[PDB]
Design an enzyme around this catalytic site. Sequence first.
Site, mmCIF file in Angstrom:
data_model
loop_
_atom_site.group_PDB
_atom_site.id
_atom_site.type_symbol
_atom_site.label_atom_id
_atom_site.label_comp_id
_atom_site.label_asym_id
_atom_site.label_seq_id
_atom_site.Cartn_x
_atom_site.Cartn_y
_atom_site.Cartn_z
ATOM 1 N N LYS A 121 4.499 26.969 13.110
ATOM 2 C CA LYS A 121 3.231 26.311 13.386
ATOM 3 C C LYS A 121 2.210 27.240 14.028
ATOM 4 O O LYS A 121 1.136 27.484 13.465
ATOM 5 C CB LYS A 121 3.459 25.044 14.245
ATOM 6 N N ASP A 171 -2.519 23.332 18.932
ATOM 7 C CA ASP A 171 -1.108 23.600 18.795
ATOM 8 C C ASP A 171 -0.470 22.417 19.471
ATOM 9 O O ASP A 171 -0.324 22.400 20.661
ATOM 10 C CB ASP A 171 -0.723 24.851 19.534
ATOM 11 N N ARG A 172 -0.121 21.428 18.664
ATOM 12 C CA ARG A 172 0.495 20.177 19.095
ATOM 13 C C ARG A 172 -0.546 19.174 19.627
ATOM 14 O O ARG A 172 -1.634 19.527 20.007
ATOM 15 C CB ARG A 172 1.657 20.441 20.063
ATOM 16 N N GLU A 221 14.708 28.826 26.200
ATOM 17 C CA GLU A 221 15.151 28.025 25.104
ATOM 18 C C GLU A 221 16.524 28.518 24.718
ATOM 19 O O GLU A 221 16.743 29.702 24.568
ATOM 20 C CB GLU A 221 14.181 28.248 23.959
ATOM 21 N N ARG A 275 12.128 31.586 22.275
ATOM 22 C CA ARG A 275 11.201 31.045 23.268
ATOM 23 C C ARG A 275 11.998 31.274 24.577
ATOM 24 O O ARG A 275 13.209 30.997 24.635
ATOM 25 C CB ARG A 275 10.959 29.551 23.014
ATOM 26 N N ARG A 302 13.367 33.268 16.220
ATOM 27 C CA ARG A 302 12.215 32.921 17.050
ATOM 28 C C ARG A 302 12.468 32.396 18.459
ATOM 29 O O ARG A 302 12.292 31.168 18.784
ATOM 30 C CB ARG A 302 11.179 32.109 16.265
ATOM 31 N N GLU A 334 -0.592 26.755 22.872
ATOM 32 C CA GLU A 334 0.438 26.079 23.617
ATOM 33 C C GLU A 334 0.309 26.639 25.002
ATOM 34 O O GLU A 334 0.375 27.826 25.176
ATOM 35 C CB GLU A 334 1.811 26.423 23.066
HETATM 36 O O1 LIG Z 1 7.121 18.104 25.403
HETATM 37 C C1 LIG Z 1 7.668 19.156 25.025
HETATM 38 N N1 LIG Z 1 9.008 19.360 25.311
HETATM 39 C C2 LIG Z 1 9.777 20.444 24.938
HETATM 40 O O2 LIG Z 1 10.952 20.455 25.243
HETATM 41 N N2 LIG Z 1 9.196 21.477 24.231
HETATM 42 C C3 LIG Z 1 10.013 22.611 23.896
HETATM 43 C C4 LIG Z 1 10.019 22.954 22.452
HETATM 44 C C5 LIG Z 1 10.165 24.439 22.402
HETATM 45 O O3 LIG Z 1 11.446 24.671 22.781
HETATM 46 C C6 LIG Z 1 9.310 24.789 23.489
HETATM 47 C C7 LIG Z 1 7.919 25.117 23.060
HETATM 48 O O4 LIG Z 1 7.405 24.057 22.370
HETATM 49 O O5 LIG Z 1 9.291 23.678 24.390
HETATM 50 C C8 LIG Z 1 7.842 21.390 23.878
HETATM 51 C C9 LIG Z 1 7.073 20.272 24.256
HETATM 52 I I1 LIG Z 1 5.059 20.098 23.664
#
Ligand SMILES: O=c1[nH]c(=O)n([C@H]2C[C@H](O)[C@@H](CO)O2)cc1I
Lengths: 302, 309
Positions: free
Chosen positions: B17, B111-112, B174, B171, B169, B34
């Site tokens: 995205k 972005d979202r 994550e 994060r 990818r 984001e």
């Molecule tokens: O409300 C949210 N909650 C969540 O857990 N995320 C996670 C998704 C991805 O791992 C990272 C970046 O998007 O964060 C994103 C959102 I907007």
Amino acid sequence: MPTLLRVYIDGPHGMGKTTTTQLLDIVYVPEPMTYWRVLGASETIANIYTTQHRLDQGEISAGDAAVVMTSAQITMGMPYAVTDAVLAPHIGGEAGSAPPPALTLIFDRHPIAALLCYPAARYLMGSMTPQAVLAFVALIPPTLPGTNIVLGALPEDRHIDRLAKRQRPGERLDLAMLAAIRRVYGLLANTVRYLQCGGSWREDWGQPRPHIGDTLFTLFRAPELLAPNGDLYNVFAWALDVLAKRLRSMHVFILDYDQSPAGCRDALLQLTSGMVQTHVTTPGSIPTICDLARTFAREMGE
Amino acid sequence: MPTLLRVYIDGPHGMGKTTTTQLLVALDIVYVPEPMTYWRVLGASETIANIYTTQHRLDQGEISAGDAAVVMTSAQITMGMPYAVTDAVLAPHIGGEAGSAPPPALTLIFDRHPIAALLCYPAARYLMGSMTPQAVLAFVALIPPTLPGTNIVLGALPEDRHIDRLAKRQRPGERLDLAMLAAIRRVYGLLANTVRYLQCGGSWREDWGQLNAGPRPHIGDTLFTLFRAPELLAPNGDLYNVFAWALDVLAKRLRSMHVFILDYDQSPAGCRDALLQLTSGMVQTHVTTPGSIPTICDLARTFAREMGE
Ligand SMILES: O=c1[nH]c(=O)n([C@H]2C[C@H](O)[C@@H](CO)O2)cc1I
Ligand SMILES: O=c1[nH]c(=O)n([C@H]2C[C@H](O)[C@@H](CO)O2)cc1I
């Protein structure tokens, strides 16, 4: 179209609000006690007061108290939030602020109680982050026309005496929370006047109507909200613009509580005369609102 | 009067995205990223790391359900604030629908959308057992009023392919949870279905007992199917009215959204042009003041400068 009068009885707890408004064409949207105790989670009230106790006693951390506290504030204002959302469509425009309304809706508190005041008061108690507080402000629904907020007035020593009686299940007498909550509500009334007298927080931030130092804006000069050069981050400054927008259009009324349930009840009836009512949006708006108000009371009111 | 075109690219993570949103803007147009910096410093510390670790501890049996929900709920509140303040600040500027109609004076690419933080992720986390249905419904009830011209582009990518993509990818914080991937994917599928079910005349109250661009889907193919939880049910068997009223809010919020689907199973340049193609047929809106353009422009540029990357 018929006219409706909305009245949100709000202020710190333990003043006699509920116990004199029940006394008071007129429907009463009581406190969502069954939702707080059972439907949304169990004993939310108990959970709130216990965490502050463990916090106070050093058994848990500021960060521990904060996640527990934020989570619970979501549970506390849920019924207030849906009610606004489902009601919002029926609210028309101001009613040439006229004859007696078709319906008077008495609410036991307004959505800002759980979205702004209690979160602000808990930050003042060390159990909630100003960032979390500002997240809730950012989520305050737009202020519909006819939003009349009656805030309570009562001397401290006397509020402590009442509070000693209005003990919710799970509640613990915490005179600090009583003072943090009284202050918050105090600043709330000052903020509205400040905004309504044309004050601009951005212009007054560098420190007739109240001093910015006496409005809610003073709480957000928190070190967490500020950049290394003392600058408020924009996200936060935008959350403050929203607080300014939401509060300036509200109509605030003071009900002195240092009197008899009768007197309190009597006073609330007098304040009524300058509140702003509105028209409903559809023919069936009134009947639907009533059922809404009765269905909420039956289900969540205890 | 000057018009504006707002586009929110949403959908599960690990699809591409952000890259294509960038590309699209590299072709005026402004990008609202984001709020990474908010998620990891300004709002709290390493929130994404916090989210993925709590589920983990949950999974490991180290943390209890309640412990996790308390942490998830708070984490999800931090995740959405930048989205929520931006929306509330934008609102007074948004005027009536215009359409596409000629090219807009301003195009915002997001972005979202706010519903990601207030609905999709919480619903996926509820589904993962890391949050309660009442809490999700509490967020839903707080979803902001849907401004006209709300164009949502949701992504699609085959499951195997999405999984391999995710396997890269990175994060920060994550940690690769495929169960959460599917959950988030299904949530987003229901979302698309829901918008449509709603647009084909669907009524969740009329269809509760059963639990354009295509036919009306089955209520069991929509987000309403997730709220069949015993926690939300009255002894008589139906939802308590509080929750029922929250579902009314969901239907109201998603009914006016213009959802579009973008295939991510292609090259970055492909996604950009495929997206640049969906764009044309997207609803525009006037702004309420002329100076809304510069205003809007800087807010977006300020958001990005302070919270993006
Ligand atoms: O409300 C949210 N909650 C969540 O857990 N995320 C996670 C998704 C991805 O791992 C990272 C970046 O998007 O964060 C994103 C959102 I907007
Ligand atoms: O958001 C809220 N948070 C909170 O902690 N409370 C406490 C105050 C009082 O003890 C009892 C009844 O008001 O609940 C209330 C609200 I609304």
